[PDB]
Amino acid sequence: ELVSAEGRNRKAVLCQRCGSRVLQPGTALFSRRQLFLPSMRKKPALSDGSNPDGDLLQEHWLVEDMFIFENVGFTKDVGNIKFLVCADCEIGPIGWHCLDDKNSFYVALERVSHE
Ligand SMILES: [Zn+2]
Protein backbone atom coordinates (compact mmCIF):
# COMPACT_ATOMS: atom_id res chain seq x y z
CA GLU A 1 0.00 0.00 0.00
CA LEU A 2 2.75 2.49 -0.92
CA VAL A 3 1.09 3.84 -4.08
CA SER A 4 -1.95 5.99 -3.22
CA ALA A 5 -5.02 5.87 -5.49
CA GLU A 6 -2.91 7.27 -8.35
CA GLY A 7 0.19 5.38 -9.53
CA ARG A 8 2.66 7.78 -7.88
CA ASN A 9 4.95 7.22 -4.87
CA ARG A 10 3.03 8.89 -2.02
CA LYS A 11 6.20 8.76 0.12
CA ALA A 12 9.71 10.02 -0.71
CA VAL A 13 12.18 7.35 -1.89
CA LEU A 14 15.44 7.59 0.10
CA CYS A 15 18.52 5.54 -0.82
CA GLN A 16 18.33 3.29 2.25
CA ARG A 17 21.97 2.43 1.43
CA CYS A 18 23.17 6.00 2.07
CA GLY A 19 20.00 7.58 3.51
CA SER A 20 20.14 9.81 0.41
CA ARG A 21 17.13 11.48 -1.25
CA VAL A 22 16.40 9.29 -4.31
CA LEU A 23 13.01 10.54 -5.56
CA GLN A 24 10.36 12.87 -4.10
CA PRO A 25 6.87 11.87 -2.95
CA GLY A 26 4.88 12.38 -6.17
CA THR A 27 7.70 12.42 -8.75
CA ALA A 28 7.66 8.72 -9.70
CA LEU A 29 5.02 6.50 -11.34
CA PHE A 30 4.35 2.97 -10.00
CA SER A 31 5.48 -0.15 -11.93
CA ARG A 32 4.61 -3.67 -10.74
CA ARG A 33 6.73 -5.17 -13.53
CA GLN A 34 8.69 -8.34 -12.66
CA LEU A 35 12.23 -6.90 -12.87
CA PHE A 36 15.58 -8.51 -12.01
CA LEU A 37 18.37 -6.84 -9.98
CA PRO A 38 21.69 -8.73 -9.99
CA SER A 39 23.78 -7.59 -6.99
CA MET A 40 26.35 -5.30 -8.63
CA ARG A 41 28.69 -6.03 -5.70
CA LYS A 42 29.89 -9.10 -7.63
CA LYS A 43 33.55 -8.79 -6.56
CA PRO A 44 35.55 -11.95 -5.81
CA ALA A 45 34.66 -13.05 -2.24
CA LEU A 46 35.89 -16.60 -2.97
CA SER A 47 33.17 -19.26 -2.48
CA ASP A 48 30.51 -16.51 -2.26
CA GLY A 49 27.34 -17.14 -0.22
CA SER A 50 25.64 -19.49 -2.71
CA ASN A 51 23.37 -16.73 -4.07
CA PRO A 52 24.51 -15.42 -7.46
CA ASP A 53 20.87 -14.76 -8.43
CA GLY A 54 19.90 -11.08 -8.16
CA ASP A 55 16.37 -10.26 -6.97
CA LEU A 56 13.35 -10.86 -9.22
CA LEU A 57 11.21 -7.97 -7.93
CA GLN A 58 7.99 -6.60 -9.47
CA GLU A 59 7.17 -3.22 -7.87
CA HIS A 60 9.14 -0.24 -9.22
CA TRP A 61 8.75 3.54 -9.18
CA LEU A 62 8.67 4.05 -12.96
CA VAL A 63 9.81 7.65 -13.52
CA GLU A 64 9.82 9.38 -16.93
CA ASP A 65 13.04 11.34 -16.31
CA MET A 66 16.26 10.21 -14.57
CA PHE A 67 17.12 13.90 -14.03
CA ILE A 68 14.40 13.71 -11.36
CA PHE A 69 16.75 11.78 -9.06
CA GLU A 70 19.57 13.64 -7.28
CA ASN A 71 22.83 11.84 -6.42
CA VAL A 72 21.67 8.70 -8.29
CA GLY A 73 24.08 6.71 -10.50
CA PHE A 74 23.58 4.20 -13.33
CA THR A 75 25.00 0.66 -13.61
CA LYS A 76 26.02 0.13 -17.26
CA ASP A 77 24.16 -2.71 -19.00
CA VAL A 78 25.23 -5.84 -17.09
CA GLY A 79 24.54 -8.08 -20.10
CA ASN A 80 21.11 -6.88 -21.28
CA ILE A 81 19.85 -4.28 -18.77
CA LYS A 82 21.14 -0.85 -17.75
CA PHE A 83 20.68 -1.05 -13.97
CA LEU A 84 20.78 1.99 -11.65
CA VAL A 85 23.15 2.59 -8.72
CA CYS A 86 23.06 5.60 -6.36
CA ALA A 87 26.18 7.68 -7.16
CA ASP A 88 26.69 8.10 -3.40
CA CYS A 89 27.08 4.31 -3.05
CA GLU A 90 27.56 2.78 -6.52
CA ILE A 91 26.16 -0.68 -5.69
CA GLY A 92 22.53 -1.34 -6.69
CA PRO A 93 21.16 -2.49 -8.83
CA ILE A 94 18.53 -0.36 -7.08
CA GLY A 95 16.85 0.85 -10.30
CA TRP A 96 15.97 -0.98 -13.54
CA HIS A 97 16.55 0.49 -17.03
CA CYS A 98 16.30 -1.92 -19.99
CA LEU A 99 17.29 -0.77 -23.50
CA ASP A 100 13.78 -1.41 -24.86
CA ASP A 101 12.61 1.89 -23.32
CA LYS A 102 15.22 4.67 -23.18
CA ASN A 103 12.66 6.67 -21.15
CA SER A 104 11.36 3.91 -18.85
CA PHE A 105 13.29 4.60 -15.62
CA TYR A 106 12.55 2.18 -12.75
CA VAL A 107 13.31 2.52 -9.03
CA ALA A 108 12.92 -0.91 -7.36
CA LEU A 109 10.39 -0.14 -4.60
CA GLU A 110 11.61 -2.61 -1.93
CA ARG A 111 15.16 -1.68 -3.04
CA VAL A 112 14.75 1.81 -1.56
CA SER A 113 13.43 3.60 1.55
CA HIS A 114 10.15 5.55 1.75
CA GLU A 115 9.13 8.11 4.39
ZN1 LIG B 1 22.74 5.87 -2.23
Ion ligand 1 neighbours (CB, 5 A) are 15, 17-18, 20, 86, 88-89
Domains of the chain (ranges plus CATH)? 1-115 (2.170.150.10)
Phi, psi of 89 (to 5 degrees): -155, 55
Cα(88) to ligand 1 centroid in Å equals: 5
Cα(102) to ligand 1 centroid in Å equals: 22
Known binding site for Zn(2+): residues?
15, 18, 86, 89
In total, the chain counts a number of residues equal to 115
Experimental technique behind these coordinates:
NMR
